Symmetry: C3
Subunit: 314 residues, 3 copies
């Protein structure tokens, strides 16, 4: 597959710093080289310089609003750029708040995109339902057309325009949802597969349905937002908001191997990897390594093996 790598060292969508190092440790882990080791055409668009916004007091309850909306606005234009270059945008990031810019920059070029959101959280709190004020748990509320009119005018998000509808998104791996978030899920009839559904059906069926759900009517470009906390902390420990009972390494690879096989992946996000939150250097590499394997899977790496269109027996 042909990628467009976008480094996004940002963290103002949540409290803990160090998630801005994600693009760094991932690159160092050798991700770009491992991609080229496959049938991949890779172009690094560099790491986005998210300049400081010293004057960014809270907006009611929302924290660092101007800083957040800015990094998303900057990211959206970059993602749009690479999609214009006929390349799958790989946004290696910090916190999940950057999903607003990615999905927005993606939809500008591909207004018919479908979104798959692998996460332990729905991150669909409104600036009015959020109890923490951290924007990495509200990205979705900003992107839904149905919620347009419920979201306040937050400093830094004037450029924003709801690009996705409730029936164009699927959630997978949910196990920590707030009440208001749950009310939004049921009311707008959003399709999701919480860990309960995963245990019930199996990841194979869950994926069968998810794909049938988002591509049944017709084929469309897929945007995969992967929050590393969707996977169990025994696999991705170094992350800010971990939650026990997560998707397994295998389930994570299965999800992505299946996504790849559709040949419709056009947008990818690898979020919440925070090297600093690892209790041991092994938890940091265990996280990063897990984060890389998921990415590679997105672009062709299959557990049953891979081979070029040649005769290996000669």
């Amino acid at each position: 597959r042909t990628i467009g790598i976008i480094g996004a060292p940002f963290s103002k969508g949540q409290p803990r710093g160090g998630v801005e190092e994600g693009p760094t440790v991932l690159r160092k882990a050798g991700l770009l080289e491992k991609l080229k080791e496959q049938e991949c055409d890779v172009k690094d668009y560099g790491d986005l310089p998210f300049a400081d916004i010293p004057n960014d007091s809270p907006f009611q309850i929302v924290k660092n609003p101007r800083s957040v909306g800015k990094a998303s606005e900057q990211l959206a234009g970059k993602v749009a750029e690479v999609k214009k270059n006929g390349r799958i945008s790989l946004v290696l990031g910090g916190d999940h708040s950057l999903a607003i810019g990615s999905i927005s920059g993606h939809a500008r070029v591909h207004p018919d995109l479908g979104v798959i959101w692998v996460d332990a959280h729905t991150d669909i709190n409104t600036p009015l339902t959020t109890t923490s004020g951290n924007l990495h748990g509200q990205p979705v509320s900003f992107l839904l057309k149905e919620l347009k009119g419920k979201i306040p005018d937050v400093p830094g998000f004037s450029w924003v325009t709801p690009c996705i509808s409730a029936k164009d998104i699927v959630y997978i791996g949910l196990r920590d949802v707030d009440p208001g978030e749950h009310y939004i899920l049921k009311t707008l009839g959003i399709k999701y597969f919480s860990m309960t559904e995963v245990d019930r059906l199996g990841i194979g069926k869950v994926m069968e349905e998810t794909l049938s759900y988002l591509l049944g009517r017709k084929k469309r470009p897929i945007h995969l937002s992967f929050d590393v906390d969707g996977l169990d902390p025994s696999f991705t420990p170094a992350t800010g908001t971990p939650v026990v009972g997560g998707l397994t390494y295998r389930e994570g690879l299965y999800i992505t191997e299946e996504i790849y096989k559709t040949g419709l992946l056009s947008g990818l996000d690898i979020m919440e990897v925070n090297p600093s939150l690892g209790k041991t250097p092994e938890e940091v590499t265990r996280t990063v390594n897990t984060a890389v394997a998921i990415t590679l899977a997105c672009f062709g790496l299959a557990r049953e093996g891979n081979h070029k269109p040649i005769d290996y027996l000669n």
Copy 2:
């Protein structure tokens, strides 16, 4: 849901002490408060004072017979009491031998109850088939109507009267069954799902069947006996009789989430949590925390989220 909490600090059903601390660490973990944090009506009936029985020599091979039968007799009347108060009895306990009193006190008020027994063991040894003599591995043999006439007159259990039939109980999670126990399973045609069946069918089907099995004919009150050793020791390490290859955290939550959804849970047991057997203070909290989540699930806590009958968007 509306509960009736019953603390049961008992341990004479097995060798290791410290399981009598279970009600204590569970309460301290904040279980009662977490229940009220939900749509729960909670009434604490206190911790039962299980006075000593200094004169309790063995009965053939059975250990502490008078002490055991006594704590069960005391518990049975308490459970009956709370069920008379229209409340689901939550028996936080020590060893599993206390199941005799719970299920008995439950059936007095609800003679048509169905039993689900999540455990790594069938605990159906008779005082005559038991090779260890520990009563926390024989509770079931005392409660079956079909085995009435095979069980000797053990000091402390004269009050006992078999209240459940072989076709009213389902086992889930079996992986360590004695030969005599197995002979009883097959001979009385008891329905069970050992880890083998779980791996084969999946926990979703296993539950589908279990419920269809116990409620198909008609709806009846359910009594859930949960032995914390049914779950894998990587989740509930601090327990006396651990066994590898147990149910997963997720499978445990799935089982209970499904039980809750029937709206027929009327009796619950949280057994074998022994703080003292933890190799680290983290194994103790990992166990207790796991023990709490399972309880909460029984009363409504759903992984996909929860919300009150209000308009969260206002």
Copy 3:
């Protein structure tokens, strides 16, 4: 079941030494006694003395060719011997290269055998596709009739004669396959269930199919080649070529419990257990213990329990 135990302390099929201790730690773990504890008729044929071959320079890229082909030749005749004694051959070994001798010695007496290969690797590299040269990753290429004419004349393997066809083998647990290996899989139409298929279908279906695949047409003798690295390293850490995302303890027991139930197991291999590669003495026992349980399962040990044809209630 009735077994013929064959100790195979060999390691020249791979770089790390210490895997030759496998038969030792397994025996010490009490495997032979645990088998007799069941309905098993056990005869220990001792540990094969694999004399050194000081003069064994590489053959092109292949390492220790003369040493390897020799231990396989010796093992083949032993396996043939025990199968002639109407006994299931249990080859406790070192590296997986010994599969060549086992499957060969097995087929001499049972030319219609079916092979199930539980491994993280297909070990089907040819001396010409192998990039490492380690023979414990090529055993299969030596045994396939379809590859006869592609394999060079390697010093030590003149006695060898391809006894199995591509449609008589099933792979389970694959997650690390080389490109040439993958080309051979697809080209010869070999049936396999990589971890992807396991996650998709479940281990219950995977086994359903595997068995239907190898026994559908007619019943035939089964040879189970179990590489301990097929299971996840969290279960079998002390092994040379570990790979994350492996089969679970439960899945491993399920596979074998199912194999046993066919009543067609005639050949078994327990390979790659290397005590020396354990980071802790607990990783060594965790591996060995896991290795034993799998063996016992092969011969009747069922998680739901076991009982003799007697009346336990008397």
